[PDB]
Amino acid sequence: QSVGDSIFPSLGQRGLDVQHYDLHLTVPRPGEPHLSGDVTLTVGAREPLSRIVLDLLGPRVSAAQWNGQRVRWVQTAQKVEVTLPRPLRPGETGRLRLIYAGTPELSGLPIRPGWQNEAGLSYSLSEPHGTRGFLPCNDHPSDPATFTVRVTVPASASAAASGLFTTQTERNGLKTLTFTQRVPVPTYALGLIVGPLERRTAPDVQLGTQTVHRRDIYAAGLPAGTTVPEGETARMLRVLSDWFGPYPDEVYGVALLPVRQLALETAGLTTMPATSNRERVRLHALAHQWFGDQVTLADWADTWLSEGFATYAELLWAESQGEDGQAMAADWYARLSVLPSRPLRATREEEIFDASAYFRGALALHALRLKVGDAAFGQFLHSYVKTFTGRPVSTTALLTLVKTQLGAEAEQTLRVWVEGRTLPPLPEP
Ligand SMILES: N[C@@H](Cc1ccc(O)cc1)C(=O)O
Numbered sequence: 001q002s003v004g005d006s007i008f009p010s011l012g013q014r015g016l017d018v019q020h021y022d023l024h025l026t027v028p029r030p031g032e033p034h035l036s037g038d039v040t041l042t043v044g045a046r047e048p049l050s051r052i053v054l055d056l057l058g059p060r061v062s063a064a065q066w067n068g069q070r071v072r073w074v075q076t077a078q079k080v081e082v083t084l085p086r087p088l089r090p091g092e093t094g095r096l097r098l099i100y101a102g103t104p105e106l107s108g109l110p111i112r113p114g115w116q117n118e119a120g121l122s123y124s125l126s127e128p129h130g131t132r133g134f135l136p137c138n139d140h141p142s143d144p145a146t147f148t149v150r151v152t153v154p155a156s157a158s159a160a161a162s163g164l165f166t167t168q169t170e171r172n173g174l175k176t177l178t179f180t181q182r183v184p185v186p187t188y189a190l191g192l193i194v195g196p197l198e199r200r201t202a203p204d205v206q207l208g209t210q211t212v213h214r215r216d217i218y219a220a221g222l223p224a225g226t227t228v229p230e231g232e233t234a235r236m237l238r239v240l241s242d243w244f245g246p247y248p249d250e251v252y253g254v255a256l257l258p259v260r261q262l263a264l265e266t267a268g269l270t271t272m273p274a275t276s277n278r279e280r281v282r283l284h285a286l287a288h289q290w291f292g293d294q295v296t297l298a299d300w301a302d303t304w305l306s307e308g309f310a311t312y313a314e315l316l317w318a319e320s321q322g323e324d325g326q327a328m329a330a331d332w333y334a335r336l337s338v339l340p341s342r343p344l345r346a347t348r349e350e351e352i353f354d355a356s357a358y359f360r361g362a363l364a365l366h367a368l369r370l371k372v373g374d375a376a377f378g379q380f381l382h383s384y385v386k387t388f389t390g391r392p393v394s395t396t397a398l399l400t401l402v403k404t405q406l407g408a409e410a411e412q413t414l415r416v417w418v419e420g421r422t423l424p425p426l427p428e429p
């Protein structure tokens with residue numbers, strides 16, 4: 001039935017491949033949760049599907065169509081179930097349109113994820129499973145998709161979503177802005193912010209033959225000194241892309257909010273509360289554009305593949321800026337040595353964003369790197385991103401790739417960090 005996630009066993013639909021969300025979201029009063037939505041999903045299937053089953057938590061569906069025709073549907077508990085006129089089979093696609101309105105609901109986690117409302121702002125901060133609050137979706141990272149979003153807001157407000165901004169139209173005191181996310185990312189990586197905000201472009205960044213556009217969002221009311229330092233994002237894109245491969249998206253920037261919250265690596269536009277706005281955090285979120293947004297999780301138990309890689313990116317950045325990488329690893333280790341440890345595959349919701357997922361995962365990569373040397377390690381990161389582009393990653397699959405690409409000894413080095421209940425000793429040269 002569901003995707004069968006080991007942590008969130010009810011989310012998603014087994015076999016469903018949502019390929020594109022075409023969302024028209026209308027927010028009448030930014031900062032208050034009520035909203036209305038009109039979305040068309042382009043869906044395929046990995047196995048014959050007799051129904052399309054989507055996650056939805058709060059809003060109520062009022063109408064549904066399949067390929068532009070009337071269709072049988074029911075909203076039950078936390079799902080919308082659409083009965084198809086005949087099975088959707090692999091290689092076919094159909095267009096599921098849903099009209100809905102109401103109040104998104106917020107879901108051991110670091111935050112209560114979903115559609116946030118505070119201080120005249122409404123915005124998605126939905127990792128892991130909050131997007132279903134404001135968007136009927138297959139809400140699981142194993143099924144990324146592209147997004148086209150039209151956001152309608154009062155004329156006095158503005159909006160920003162993941163994807164290149166094209167047009168803004170206005171009538172009867174309402175503005176509609178269109179954003180196009182052209183590379184597929186998980187549902188929670190869809191950035192979407194409405195309220196008093198301004199879009200500010202910066203010069204394109206050249207990464208060899210690749211061009212990366214630049215823009216940041218500045219919400220009104222930011223603390224004095226809330227900035228994106230000039231030249232920094234270009235330097236980071238160069239350092240990380242030289243380690244990981246081409247930047248996966250068409251644009252990058254941050255959306256700075258005057259709120260007090262964790263930063264989230266929403267696609268091409270990181271949602272950045274000002275309280276988290278630090279150089280290392282900006283690097284970390286940019287690293288997620290590869291590790292989490294492009295390379296997506298098959299199962300929420302494997303969050304260390306996102307958080308541990310993004311954390312290790314901080315050490316690569318530090319070294320690129322002349323700092324001592326081994327000292328940073330020792331800092332990570334000192335932090336863990338007085339905390340409980342766990343194998344890296346999580347078994348409980350409380351664990352998926354705990355210290356082990358970030359810092360034990362990063363030290364696992366440090367151990368691997370020290371085993372194989374920097375040339376092999378960088379080649380491996382390139383191969384890893386390629387191997388798991390279009391294919392959700394797992395801890396088992398990573399170990400297989402290390403074994404085949406780097407050999408049995410390297411796999412054993414990583415496995416000691418992946419498995420085992422006690423914290424291994426600090427990896428040293
Ligand atoms: N992904 C964030 C942590 C986070 C998790 C869930 C959220 O809803 C928000 C933020 C990080 O990189 O640290």
Ligand code: NA
Pocket residue numbers: 017018019143144145
């Ligand atoms: Na998909």
Ligand SMILES: [Zn+2]
Pocket residue numbers: 284288306307310311
């Ligand atoms: Zn992270």
